[PDB]
């Protein structure tokens with residue numbers, strides 16, 4: 001039994017809710033919140049900008065030190081950093097950005113990172129300003145992630161489209 005409330009169950013392990021992932025992180029304080037990161041961990045906009053702003057820029061400060069030590073992530077890769085005031089940990093996951101021409105097949109590799117964590121609060125990878133089709137992202141998520149994932153979809157209209165079109 002966990003504390004996520006008001007989710008619709010899609011499969012054995014994937015749940016979805018029309019919610020602001022920032023507000024959901026602040027209320028649940030999950031072990032893991034997933035960030036929709038880029039390889040430089042520059043949290044300027046979209047989910048990443050919203051999460052970083054909610055940490056008063058502490059996420060960005062920590063991220064800049066991480067990059068200075070380790071260099072950029074790979075598209076499809078991830079790193080675990082602090083969750084600050086939002087979660088125990090933040091899993092920064094880099095989905096391909098279609099608006100940069102990155103290979104959409106890397107989306108499955110990106111979701112595989114979720115399997116290293118028993119339970120996660122997460123957005124749909126490569127959705128929003130990353131330019132992929134959220135319905136495709138949801139399909140890859142369900143077909144790749146085996147651990148328990150609570151997806152927060154900010155847009156109500158998209159949310160109902162995702163629910164109404166789900167197989």
Ligand SMILES: NC(=O)Nc1ccc(C(=O)N[C@@H]2c3cccc(O)c3C[C@@H]2C(=O)O)cc1
Nearest residue numbers: 022046047050123124127128134153154155
């Ligand atoms: N307090 C805050 O600013 N919160 C906050 C700000 C921005 C985002 C975001 O960019 N969402 C994205 C989006 C939008 C419209 C269609 C989408 O397919 C997506 C994917 C993303 C998602 O819904 O996961 C999420 C939360």
